[model samples]
Structures are given as structure tokens and as C-alpha cells.
Target: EMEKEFEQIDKSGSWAAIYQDIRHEASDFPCRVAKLPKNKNRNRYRDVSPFDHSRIKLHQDNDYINASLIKMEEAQRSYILTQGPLPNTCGHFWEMVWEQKSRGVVMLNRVMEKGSLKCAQYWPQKEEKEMIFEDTNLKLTLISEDIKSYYTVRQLELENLTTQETREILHFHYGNWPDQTAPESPASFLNFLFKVRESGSLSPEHGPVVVHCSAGIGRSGTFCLADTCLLLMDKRKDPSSVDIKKVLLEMRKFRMGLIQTADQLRFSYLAVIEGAKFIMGDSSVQDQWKELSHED
Candidate 1:
């Protein structure tokens, strides 16, 4: 990290406190500012790999989750619709399959295992990909081509489930989300989602789309929030009315809880806010982000 090693400024003599301040100053914020009581679940990736470079960063603020909510609201408005399964996170290979109601249908996942992809006889392949919300055969753009996967990555498979051949698009990006340590950036993720919308896709007939990550929560939640923020920006809408806070608290019809760890949530909040800032021409966000990327 491009930071000076700070001699311990004993804030209170607690080693934990001293370390916390060091981390905060080194990272340019309160380390784990919104610390949630440590999650006891040993299996969740966010819990198991707190310092993994493939995941989000740490923070101590309890309000970290709320900040992420703000990003979620803005992202949803940019998209036609969104969906998710019960348990979406980066730890478990997860899947979500649902009909889009007006357009067609969608099947999505963060990580797909052969067993899970095999659950449905119709698997999405590298070639001849299916659309997200239309019946006509459409060429889909590929993102994150470097991701390693044994089982074939599936397409949305938008077929004759609806009436008219509404425009459809599909997007897939592979990497750790809501994790500060991940290699991908929020801008790159938005670019992936925008590419899908550029395909002029519509929703399906079943009325909901599908989203799932390994655990079906953290990465998926981060994806959902970023997508929502982008949508709000495109529409020139006031996110305050339909912001992430309300979405998380009142109108959480889609899904609830993004990640299991406070650190991941804090990073998710920064990604969306700074991500949106970058979208709106705020270079300062990138500056802060740059600070985050320096060699420690």
C-alpha cells in the first residue's frame, strides 16, 4: 500500500483500537467503521476469507449497510427488472431461474457448477447464446472471458415463452463483487450491464428475472445495487424516492441482505457511491479508489 507506516498512536491502549486506527488511517477511513457483530457462520465466503484479495474490503461503521442501500436504489432504476434466489453470495455455486413475464425468461448465476448447470437440460454455451427477454436468436456479447469454468456458462435462454419477439440481451461478468480485494471495478461491472441493455431486451412473461451467486447474497446483492444505481442515473430520476434505503427497508420485494460481513457491505457501499460518482463525472471517487489500490 502507498502509505506511510504509522507508529502506533495509542488512541486508548486497546491493541484492537490501535490497530483499527492504523488500518483506518492507512486505508483513508475508519477500518470496519460499520462493524457488524462477527458472523459465526464459518462457511460463508465473506466470513471465511475476510482478507482475500478476491473480495471486498473491511470497515467498522455500523451504517455501512445503509450506505450500500443508497447505491442499490440508484442501480435498480436503470434496469428493466431484477431477480434473485434465496441464498446469493460468493461462497456457494448458486443459480436463479425465472420467467420475465412480458419478455421471456432468464437464468443467471455468479458461479455455475456442472451439477447445477446440469439441473436444467438446456445449458447456456459459449456459442449460440440465448437472449434474456426475447424469442428471436440474438448474438450476445461476452464479458469476463478470462474466468475459469469447467461447466459451460449458460445463457438467459429467452425463447417462445412470450408473445412478441421483444428485444432481449444478456450479460455475464466473472469476478468477486462487494469485495474490495477483487480485481474488477464497479465501472467494468456497469459496462457489462449496459451491454446487455444495449441489446434492446425486454422482460419475460413470468414477471421476474433471476440472479444468484455462490451464496446468493453478497456478490449478487452488490450486482443488484450497482445495476439499480445505473438505472437511476440513466432515467434522470430522483433516487431519494426509490433509494436503496427504502428498497432495503420497506420495498424489499426482490430479496434481502446482500453480504454477511460488515466489511463486504462497507466496500459495496463505496463501490456504488464511487461507482456512481465515476459515472456522473466525479473523478474524486476514482482518486479515493486509487488510494485504495496503492501497494501496502
Candidate 2:
């Protein structure tokens, strides 16, 4: 069943076609918030904008955050896909985390990428036990951190200073992808996806797993799409039942510029294909991946 779908996708050139079609729509709709003056510089580029209908709305502020809520009900999953925290917007970033009660933050970009700041150091560093965001009036403490071959998992404590409430949040950071390219292979990416899955943060019971990359749509979208499709395949017990193109298009409605490059979109399909192998009782394939660490 999975092989048939792969053959069909290859023969139809569907993924490439979908990538080009999204690019075409950008010109007419553009999705930019030129009319909204405050958001002029909040976004890294003029083209990427959160869809109004499904965007993650802030209760206390009128100004927008470049974020959107992607809900996949059939797969029993939800995620908040947003851009990396900017120096000025870091306050709002923590505020959203606090308000949403998200248990996990999956960060795909490093603080610096190709000598440019892709994301701010939003969480506390090694030397510091706690870091306070005066602007947001929230406190973040580093409880523990575990560094691995391609990722780092940190346990953080988030506190609401005003209410005196606190919660533990898991932070998963993938550090190996190049500046403007996808991961080198599907095995590593699939392993990372499974690691996040084992955390239980992506489950529906949690608030929502916050996933972010530099601009929030490219790598962020890739991760969500691969996971969503793979989960649907697993749940239904039939790989052919999953529609990869449909899932990506549905996700695009919530956030603009998802899977930015054709290469990124292509990589997503590859990851999903590789992931389906394990979901289909490929024990040997699953054994190749190191067990998800519980040390932290």
C-alpha cells in the first residue's frame, strides 16, 4: 500500500506541483499584512503571514504574533507553528507559552545560522539557574539539560510571577540541519520525530506542542506535516489511506509559506515514507534508533 502511493506520487510529480502552485498563489494573495502598520517589522519577510481564521490570537494584545494553530483532529494532534522569537517579541513568546500551557517547545533552528540570528536565546543558558523576562513578567528556570548526537532536551520550569503558578516545559532542540537545507537523511529526521512523539507533548491532552524555526513555516511545517501524515497512517493501519498533498494544503491554510522550498517539501515526503516503515512493524528499523532519553 505504501509503495503504491510512493509510485503514484513519483509518477504524478505531485509534490513538486504542489510546491509550485503554492508559490503561484503567493503573488495574487501575497498574505502580507501591509495594512497593519504594527506588524511591518514583526515578521522577518513581507510574504509570511498567519492566516486570520486559524491564527493563535492573543487575549491581552491587539498586535499580532506570527503564529498559527494547526489542528489535525483525525490524528489527535495539535501544534502551534510560529516564527523563532525575535529580540523584541521574546516577551510575547513566553506569554503565549504561559497562556497556552504548552508542555513542550520543539525548536528547529539554532540561535545563530550562517552568521545570522535565526532565533533568539529565549530560554535560560547553562550558567544561569533562572532567567526572568521583565517585559512579560514571567520566570524561566533550567531544571536540567541532556545533550545528544543531533538534539538537546531540556527540562524548564515556567512560572507566572503574578499568579505564583508554575509548570514544567520540555524543550527539544534539533541542532544539525544546515543553514538553508533539510537534514541530510530521513533516518535522522524520523528518529527525531519519534523522540518528540515519545515525550507525549504532541498528544491531544496537552495544550499544544509549540514548533518553531527561523521564519516558522519552512522547517516547522515540514516537521508537522511528516508527523501528521505518519500518525494518520498508523492509526488507520493503511498507508494508502493517508493523503500527503491534502494534509500539506490543509496546513497551509493556517500558516503561510509552509514547506518553503521544494527541497523541504520533498524532504517531508521522504521522512514520512521512512517513518511509515517503523509504524508497519519494522522492528529492526526501530532498533537502529537509540531509545529516547529519560535522563532529563
Candidate 3:
């Protein structure tokens, strides 16, 4: 029961034990492709690399990008998790999006966070309106903008310059995610997640939604894990049926070092516990989140 198991873990300070126990589950998985000399510069962090088995391939060239395909079969939901685009790999980034047919990109950090560069300025801002990635013959035109205190949603038009084709993609930028910390409020995070979920873009009808942060593992993993856990629990209608450690290990099969910190892992549990209230029967729990959240 959620009451017995989670309450014991919460009382016994065992989340740390669980985090360490599963930290090395898939250390043997090789990421040789990302370590290649030619592709070295594409990675945002030397230690964070996409596993070869699930990495997304570009339409052009040998198709190496620091991104992984994550799928949750029970809910029929999937997502692409990748590192922030580097200055040189921006073309490969967009090319991967175009080829994969991703309907949206969820960015959990700003281009600059805490006065340092966390992610490259990969898309066109309102001032520019558009930017071209000559290497991939692709362009991104900013179509619409919706801003919030801690998050912003933008509509982008992705154009294949050579083929003269266009596609609309939603860019959900969550600016308040702190550096190496859980979100201040679960409600704020839930509000932001629900906003993206409401778009119905995360469904299987479209390609996998693209999600990234600086290294694409810590905060990125937290978001997907919480979302996936809630989804699985809602399907089962029983919170205890969803084993978070098992889910994290399953996701690690596709990407390495997800949920990077003890706090992040701890936060994932808190989020699942909070969101379970809504799935367990209180529909107004999410309404309380919207009220508690300052991001709206």
C-alpha cells in the first residue's frame, strides 16, 4: 500500500539507499558513438552520452546526435531525451527532430542559467523571427508566443529548406527549474507538465516528443519519470503497482545516468506521491495545483 511502503521509506530515510542501489544498473551499456573524435563536440557534457542502441539518427550523414528514444509501452507514450544542442550540432538537432517527426520539444532550462550557458540558443526568438541551419538545410520560424512567469510556450514552424516542406512544432520552455535541485513546488511543476500534457502531443498518434535540459539526464529524467509514473498509476488505478525503481531502470536501458542526484530522485518520489492524489480519485487535486502554482 502507498501508506505502508512509502511511509516506511519516507520515515526510514531509505530513498538514498534506493538511489545508490540502482545507480549502476546499466553501467555496461556502451556509448562509443558519442565518444568518436568527430562527434565529440556534439555532447554538452563529457560524461553524459546517449546509448547507441536508442540514440536518434539524423536523416543526413552518419546521423549521430546526443539523444535517446524513451518509450513507456503500458501507456503507449514515448519521448526523446537529449542533451542541450551545442553550437555545432544545432543542425543535427533540428535534422533529428525533422526526421523523427517530433511534434514538440520540451526544454527544462534556459539558454543561460545562473549566469552560465546551459543550452545553446537553438531556436529563433521573437526578435529574430527565424534562423537557418545551413548544414542541415533547415530553418525555424517563430510563429506565436505565450509567456508565463516561470514558463513560456511558443509555436515554431520547422521548414525543410531544400524540399520546401514545413511543420509546426510546439516549444515548451520551463525557465524556473533550479540548478541541481527539485522544483520549489510540486504544484508548479505539475502545472507546467499538465500544460504540455493538455496539448495531446505526448500521445502515440504523433512522433515522440523531444525533451532536454543542459545534460538531458537530471531534470529531464525527473519530468519524464514523474509523468510516466503518474500515467502508469492512472492506468492501473493503484499507485503501488508502479514501481519507480523498475521504471527508472527501464529508462536507463535507453539513456544513461537519468535522475542524476539524490535530491532529484527524492523529488521524483514526491511528485509521484502528490500526483497520485489526482489519479486515486480526487480530480480537484490538479485544480489545487493550478491554484498553488504561480507559473500560470
Candidate 4:
């Protein structure tokens, strides 16, 4: 019934209703910190802003970053959604990761997209080479990398130079999210979702997983909405009781512009329906998904 409602929600004007429903989800408060002139340079896009209420604060004096901590009590899941790192904000990006104790950082876009730089090269490209952040006194050394057609998994050693403490963080880069079109296949996207789940970095024992796109809300928000709704299905006595729209609205309270486009909203529903099969005890479907997944 939830799935059916999701399908019917796509009927012509119904999508407009859904899109407006999200569009009007209000922040109601000023993004005071993100709007400060000193913090202006940290933001990637001028239009995309973070709500000050739920915005994550860093230890620095100018504690401003376009990031939010989204916590879902029902799903027992948490994610730090942020804009892609700028050349200067790259240090603060990792500072947020370290301060929040996040075990994984999920990037949904490429460094270069279309014609412009969508994200900075924050991590070391070559093996064994380290990317140093002078401001934060942190060093990220790529320990290993496993590449797939649509995504890449990287193990990074995050060292806090001040404290001389280090921890291994997984950099899960899902490079296939499109700028103009949402993903066409549920299998490939779902497989990558499950791959992150199997890695256990999203587990509650670990810190919140950092999820970001260029603006941190569109594709990254889609990732959170789908993952949370799918987890709700696993815990619910009746999966149809889950109200996808309401869940998204609840999430928007913590961050602005989540699930930015109607197509993205539709993709979340599609991914959830596909992922539901896996939670319903159909392990074979995942194998089929893996096979259908065109590995890059």
C-alpha cells in the first residue's frame, strides 16, 4: 500500500503536490552563522544554506560550515549532511568528521562535474601520499582503495597531529549520482546502499556517517531518506505504516532542501521499494542486483 501510494504520487500534478510539500517545509529561522561575512568563504554555493538551529558547530573561533546533523529516532540512524569541501574549507570538513567521531564519509558527486569543480580534492589521490591540513593539524593518508563502476571505497588514516591520535575512516564515494537526472536503476544504487550497510560504518556504535553532494541536500538527502525509510520497514510490523512524506518533512527540520527535486523524491520511493525486497528475506535479489550492477 505504501508502495502503491508512492506510485500514484507520481501521477502528473500529484508530483507537484509532493514537490511543493517539500518546498514549503520551513526552516523558519535565519542561518545566522552561515550568513556571517567571515564564514561566507566556507560555503560552496551562495544559495544553499544550512539552518543555524541544527547546524553542526566546530571547535574553531569562526565555527561556521554548511553542514547539519540529521538524527532519526525511529530508524535509529544519524547522518552529517554537508556541502562539498571548498579549497579552504577542506580542513574544517575533516575537522567536523573528527569532532563528530564519524567513521565514514559518503561523497555522492565527483570532484569535477559537467564543466566545473563540484568538490575539492580533499583526499590524497596517490597511494601512500598524505593530504595535510595545516589549519586543523590533521593528516589524511589513504590506506587502500577498492574501485567499482559507480562507487569507490577508500580506507583513510585520520591523524590528529595535536593529540597524535589516529583512526581509520572509510571514504565511500558514490560517483554515479547525476546532475540533471536521478539514477535510472534501483539495483545499482541499492547495491551501493547495501554495501555501505555491510561495512557497518553506519552502525549506531560508530559516529554519524557524513553524507554530502555539492550542496549536501539533494543526492545526499535522497540517500538519507531512502536509507531511513528502508530501515523503518525492517522494524515495523507493517511496512506500509511508514509515511515517506512525513519522514522527509521530519528530516527537513534538521537540514534545508532535502530531496531537492521531484525526480529525486521519486527515486527515493523506487529505491525503498527495491530495498524492501532485501529486508523481506530475499537474499537472491541482492545477488541479482549485484549482477545487474554494471561495475565500473
Q: What lDDT score belongs to each candidate, Candidate 1 first?
A: 0.34, 0.80, 0.87, 0.88
By lDDT, is 2 or 4 better?
Answer: 4
Off by over 4 Å in 3: none
Q: Which candidate is the best by TM-score?
A: 4
TM-score of each: 0.42, 0.89, 0.95, 0.96
TM-score of 3: 0.95
What does candidate 1's lDDT look like per residue over 247-286, in tens digits? 3332123333444343433444444554565556664755
**Residue pairs clashing, model 3:** none
Q: By TM-score, how accurate is candidate 4?
A: 0.96
Residue 110 C-alpha lDDT in model 4: 94
Rank order (by lDDT, best first) = 4, 3, 2, 1
lDDT of 3 by residue, 122-187 (tens): 998873768999888998999998998889999999999888999999999998897579998888
Better of 2 and 3 by TM-score: 3
Give the worst 10-residue stretch by lDDT in candidate 3: 1-10
Candidate 3 C-alpha RMSD relative to the actual structure = 1.5
Residue 266, candidate 2: C-alpha displacement in angstroms: 1.9
Which is the winner by TM-score between candidate 1 and candidate 2?
2
